[PDB]
Amino acid sequence: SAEKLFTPLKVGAVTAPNRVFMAPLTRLRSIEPGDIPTPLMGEYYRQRASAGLIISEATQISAQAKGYAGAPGLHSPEQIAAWKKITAGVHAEDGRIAVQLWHTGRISHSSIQPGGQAPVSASALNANTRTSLRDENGNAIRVDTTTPRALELDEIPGIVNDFRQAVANAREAGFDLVELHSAHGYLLHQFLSPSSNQRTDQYGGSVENRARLVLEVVDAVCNEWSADRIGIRVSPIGTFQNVDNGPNEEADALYLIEELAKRGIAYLHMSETDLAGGKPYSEAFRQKVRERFHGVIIGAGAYTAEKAEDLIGKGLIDAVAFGRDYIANPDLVARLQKKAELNPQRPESFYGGGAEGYTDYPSL
Ligand SMILES: Cc1cc2nc3c(=O)[nH]c(=O)nc-3n(C[C@H](O)[C@H](O)[C@H](O)COP(=O)(O)O)c2cc1C
Ligand SMILES: Cc1c([N+](=O)[O-])cc([N+](=O)[O-])cc1[N+](=O)[O-]
Structure with a gap:
């Protein structure tokens, strides 16, 4: 029901x-x-x-x-x-698809960078985690991240242009929307967080400076296409991929949201917690976000249909994004509507490989 x-x-x-x-x-x-x-x-x-x-x-x-x-x-x-x-293919089935665009920044390895050189970031601080590469047989393997090079001030316009061009490409590729990946410790988030950003120029320090890059990107892509085609994913509360949001995470988050709202973009996608532990969003905080953003708000992070119904009913969010349940259930919509059981998840095949654990999960 x-x-x-x-x-x-x-x-x-x-x-x-x-x-x-x-x-x-x-x-x-x-x-x-x-x-x-x-x-x-x-x-x-x-x-x-x-x-x-x-x-x-x-x-x-x-x-x-x-x-x-x-x-x-x-x-x-x-x-x-x-x-x-x-x-x-998606449109042939009457669906809608947005492309999430990212720059991994310091969560990378020199072996897959152009010229085999060091990856870039806000500062020259190793992420101290691992990324996924592939071995001689094309199998996925884990490898420690390479220490990054701090982007030169003159290199930033190029980064903004790369996002702009990618969005132009997304439009021709037939995507309905674009989602900027400004979460989980990747490039944009690397600049947003003081833990990963120690810059002394206008792209580091204050929250205004730390959010400067992502906002320049939002303006650039809104101009390239249209604000109603732009979405953004953030993970402003808690710790993700070792990157922790500053000591004033809530205030900084609300600042970012108010700025995003000024652009009138299509949606705000909030990844509430990593994959591991994480303190839940208080309804008070959801209300503060709600009154600051006038577009669609998508909630995400170990959501159950019940939690989604509760929050949507309270008018705090508009939609919910399911990750792992979608990996294992192509017809998740039908299953949740019918209250049918879901296919069990097979984590070992989430990354790499082929059809097994990918197109393998049957529909009702
Ligand atoms: C296999 C896998 C890959 C992921 N890749 C991405 C992705 O490309 N971009 C991103 O923003 N988050 C990514 N996530 C996070 C998911 O979008 C989602 O926020 C997370 O799985 C929590 O939701 P869930 O409990 O419904 O799975 C990934 C998670 C998993 C398990
Ligand atoms: C957000 C995310 C990834 N990404 O594309 O930025 C990649 C991940 N991975 O392990 O390949 C995991 C991610 N996550 O779940 O936060």
């Missing part, structure tokens, strides 16, 4: 028939060389086209943005052509 989860919602330029969204999910099955999406990837997304909105796996805005072997890009002609087939 449920209630609001299966009712339409206007999301920027498109209209979702339900509020059950598919969270962006890195699966690392793209073709190398070229970081090219595959027919298998298209099959996978097509199977999940009943989602109110599909948010794609993180996709590189440039070659430099690459941090994981197997992650696709949206910067080359071959990538654009391959993505065009995928979006057409």
Whole structure:
């Protein structure tokens, strides 16, 4: 039965028939060389086209943005052509799909960077974590992150332009919306957080300076396409991928949100907690966010349909993005609507490999 989860919602330029969204999910099955999406990837997304909105796996805005072997890009002609087939497949099934665009920053390794050089970031501080590469046989492997080089002030306009160009490419690729990856400790978040940003120029220090980059990017992409085509994912509260939001995380978060609201973008996607522990959002905080953003708000992070219904009913959020449940259930919408049991998850195949654990999960 449920209630609001299966009712339409206007999301920027498109209209979702339900509020059950598919969270962006890195699966690392793209073709190398070229970081090219595959027919298998298209099959996978097509199977999940009943989602109110599909948010794609993180996709590189440039070659430099690459941090994981197997992650696709949206910067080359071959990538654009391959993505065009995928979006057409989703649309053939009457679905909607947004491409999540990212620059991994310091969460990368020199071996997959242009020229095999050090990756870039706000400052020259190692992320002290690991990323995923592939071995001689194309199998996914874990490797310690390479220490980054701090972007030169004169290099920032280039980063902004790369996001702008990627969005232009997304539009031609047939995507309905674009979601800027400003969360989980990747490049944009690296600048936002004081723990990963020790810059002394105008891109470091105060929250205004730390949010300068992401806002420049938002303005650039809104100008390139249209504000109602732009979405953004943030993870402003708590600790993620070792990157911790400052000592004034709530205040800084509300500052960022008010700035984003001024651009009138399509939506605000909030990743509430990493994959491990994390303090839950208080309704008081959800209200403060709610009154500051006038577009669609998407909640995410170990959500249950019940929690989604509760929060949507309270008018605090508009939709919910499910990640792992979508990996294992292509027809999650139908299952949640019918209160049917879900397929069990197979974590060992979340990353890399082929069809097994990917297009493997049956629909009702
Ligand atoms: C295999 C896997 C890959 C992920 N890749 C991405 C992604 O590309 N971009 C991102 O923003 N978050 C990513 N996430 C986080 C999910 O979007 C989501 O926020 C998280 O899984 C929590 O939601 P869930 O409990 O419904 O799965 C990933 C998580 C998993 C398990
Ligand atoms: C957000 C995210 C990833 N990403 O694309 O930025 C990649 C991940 N991974 O392990 O490949 C995991 C991510 N996550 O769950 O936060």
